[PDB]
Amino acid sequence: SMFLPPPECPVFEPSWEEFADPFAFIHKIRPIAEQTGICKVRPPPDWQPPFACDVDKLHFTPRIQRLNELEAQTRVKRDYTLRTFGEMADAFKSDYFNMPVHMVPTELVEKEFWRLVSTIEEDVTVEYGADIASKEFGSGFPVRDGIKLSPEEEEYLDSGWNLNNMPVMEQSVLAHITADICGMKLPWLYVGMCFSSFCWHIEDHWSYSINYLHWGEPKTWYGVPGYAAEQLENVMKKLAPELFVSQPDLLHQLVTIMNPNTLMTHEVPVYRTNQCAGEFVITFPRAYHSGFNQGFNFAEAVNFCTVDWLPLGRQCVEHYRLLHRYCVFSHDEMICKMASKADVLDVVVASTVQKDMAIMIEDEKALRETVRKLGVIDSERMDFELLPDDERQCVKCKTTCFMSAISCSCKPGLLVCLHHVKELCSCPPYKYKLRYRYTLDDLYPMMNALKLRAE
């Protein structure tokens, strides 16, 4: 009546043979799971990564969170010990419900969450932990350290489902990427409590994400399939226009809490699940998702990109361009980097990169012809990858340049991508320079190397 729980998302229970290769399994479940945006994965019963930590020696700075529906929160992120946070968290929930913490039904917490975030009179604030793996935090999974690991810990060091290993495996396209994008290859750690929430969002560059709940009380998820993303955005734009005004950078992007029933009322397909300890949740490209924690828990998450994602990654950067949204990295730079490493690429990877590069080259070919007809004649090679990101963004659309850009001596340091030549300055195009990374004659052999590797 008040709150109608969305239908359950798919739950997979792979055999050991299926589970062995994470990328093969994800590709297998993709036709099913991409229709729901999110899915849950229960590992084989004996796949049990050991969790060991001193609750007194793990410190982290908590972030404070107000729980109001449609209220703006920043998309990106005192001092607790893990023990003191746990004691705070446990006391909060038990006091909130006047019940032993482990006796509060998950359906009730869900019901109550959507009540309190909607009620203006309620002024509930909670805290959470969200941080990259550091020497003060550290992954929940076993990692190699100079100290001595137990045989059980060594058993899960090179596991495909050890979230530290996923970004650097052969079937992932971020295996040989150079530029430091710490947010997209390093796992994040999340310490949650009752009602602590993550707002509606999609991952950077429409990448996958995989989440593992190491221990604690469940994490409640809501998911929307990739094909319904723009439908969701139109709904939220009409109800919360503040989230759609342009921002100075990525650190200022706004997100919010919204009842899934509101989305469902506007015919947006929403699915739910309760992620329990020891279970994986996987989010698919452009799959909007949000949720909250049932109680004190500890989760670890990392982004990743498969060969299936590559053409979507290009579409995303194009979408970023239309929105004047900042990139985390240059998609074209990634592609050309992989091309320069063709001989050591996985053969299926090489084949997929080849296809994307062909599109890249033909688009670049047309763009350069266009700007030449605009009067830009002079040109010089430029190593874009050497520039800091904020020193090679298009003035107009904020895209990260790599293949090419336009410069003018009248605006030293300023660049525009080839889509926005008319946005650089007021001086005539013959004063401009085409700054390019590769000639067309450089690019075709690079793509040929990929073709040979793919055979």
Ligand X SMILES: O=C(O)CCNc1cc(N2CCc3ccccc3CC2)nc(-c2ccccn2)n1
Query: What span, in angstroms and rounded, lies between the C-alpha atoms of 163 and 175?
Result: 14
Task: Record the tokens describing residue 405, joined without a space.
Answer: 């850009």
Partner from ligand X, Mn ion, Zn ion, none contacting 420, C-beta within 5 to 8 A by type: Zn ion
Partner from Zn ion, ligand X, Mn ion, none contacting 425, C-beta within 5 to 8 A by type: Zn ion
Residue 289 annotated in ligand binding: yes
Among 33, 408, 443, 454, binds Zn ion (CB under 5 A): 408
User: Is residue 410 near Zn ion by the rule CB under 5 A?
Assistant: yes
Tell the smallest beta-carbon distance from residue 48 to ligand X (Å): 20
User: Is residue 420 near Zn ion by the rule CB under 5 A?
Assistant: yes
Tell the smallest beta-carbon distance from residue 313 to Mn ion (Å): 17
User: Is residue 125 near Mn ion by the rule CB under 5 A?
Assistant: no
Q: What are the angstrom distances between the C-alpha of 77 and each of 54, 73, 242, 454?
A: 25, 10, 19, 41
Of 112 and 363, nearer to Mn ion (C-beta) is 112
Residue 205 annotated in ligand binding: no
- Rounded to 5 degrees, what are φ and ψ at 59? -110, 150
Q: Decide: 416 and 423 in contact? Cβ < 8 Å.
A: yes
Using the contact rule CB under 5 A, the part of the chain among 312-320, 336-344, 346-354, 412-420 near Zn ion is: 412-420
Query: What span, in angstroms and rounded, lies between the C-alpha atoms of 281 and 268?
Result: 21
- Rounded to 5 degrees, what are φ and ψ at 373? -75, -15
User: Is residue 427 near Zn ion by the rule CB under 5 A?
Assistant: yes
Of 15 and 426, nearer to Zn ion (C-beta) is 426
User: Is residue 406 near Zn ion by the rule CB under 5 A?
Assistant: no
Query: What span, in angstroms and rounded, lies between the C-alpha atoms of 101 and 137?
Result: 26
Residue 436 annotated in ligand binding: no
Partner from Mn ion, ligand X, Zn ion, none contacting 243, C-beta within 5 to 8 A by type: none
Task: Record the tokens describing residue 411, joined without a space.
Answer: 């605006």
Tell the smallest beta-carbon distance from residue 297 to ligand X (Å): 8
Of 210 and 317, nearer to Mn ion (C-beta) is 210
Pairing of strands 38-41, 280-283: antiparallel
Site for Mn ion in 61-90 (CB under 5 A): 68
Query: What span, in angstroms and rounded, lies between the C-alpha atoms of 207 and 39?
Result: 15
Partner from ligand X, Mn ion, Zn ion, none contacting 122, C-beta within 5 to 8 A by type: Mn ion
Of 76 and 108, nearer to ligand X (C-beta) is 76
Using the contact rule CB under 5 A, the part of the chain among 30-38, 87-95, 121-129, 271-279 near Mn ion is: 121-129
Tokens 């430029």 found at: 382
Tell the smallest beta-carbon distance from residue 301 to ligand X (Å): 5
Of all residues in the shown chain, the one whose CB is closest to Mn ion is 122
- Rounded to 5 degrees, what are φ and ψ at 255? -135, 175
Counting other chains too, the contacts that 446-449 makes at CB distance below 8 Å and 24 or more residues apart are 446/336, 446/339, 446/340, 446/342, 446/357, 447/339, 447/354, 447/357, 447/358, 447/361, 449/339, 449/342, 449/343
Residue 209 annotated in ligand binding: yes
Partner from ligand X, Zn ion, Mn ion, none contacting 68, C-beta within 5 to 8 A by type: Mn ion
Of 210 and 376, nearer to ligand X (C-beta) is 210
Partner from Mn ion, ligand X, Zn ion, none contacting 128, C-beta within 5 to 8 A by type: ligand X
Residues that bind ligand X (CB under 6 A): 65, 73-77, 128, 130, 190, 198-199, 201, 203-204, 211, 255, 299, 301
Residue 122 annotated in ligand binding: no
Residues 6+ apart with CB under 8 A from 206: 226, 285, 286, 309, 312, 313, 315, 316
Pairing of strands 280-283, 125-132: unpaired
Query: What span, in angstroms and rounded, lies between the C-alpha atoms of 342 and 158?
Result: 24
Tell the smallest beta-carbon distance from residue 300 to ligand X (Å): 8
Residue 203 annotated in ligand binding: yes
The alpha carbon dihedral of 429, 432, 435, 438 has a sign of positive
Of 142 and 223, nearer to ligand X (C-beta) is 223
DSSP character string of 301-343: EEEE--TTTHHHHHHHHHHHHHHTPPPSS-HHHHHHHHHTTGG
Q: Decide: 265 and 171 in contact? Cβ < 8 Å.
A: no
Of 329 and 402, nearer to Mn ion (C-beta) is 329
Dihedral class, residue 175 (left if φ above 0, else alpha if ψ from -120 to 50, else beta): alpha
Residue 211 annotated in ligand binding: yes
User: Is residue 122 near Mn ion by the rule CB under 5 A?
Assistant: yes
Of all residues in the shown chain, the one whose CB is closest to Zn ion is 410
Partner from Zn ion, ligand X, Mn ion, none contacting 417, C-beta within 5 to 8 A by type: Zn ion
Query: What span, in angstroms and rounded, lies between the C-alpha atoms of 79 and 130?
Result: 13
Residue ranges at the known binding site for 2-oxoglutarate: 128, 209, 211, 219
Residue ranges at the known binding site for Fe cation: 201, 203, 289
In the complex, which residues of this chain contact Zn ion (CB under 5 A)? 394, 396-397, 408, 410, 417, 419-420, 425, 427
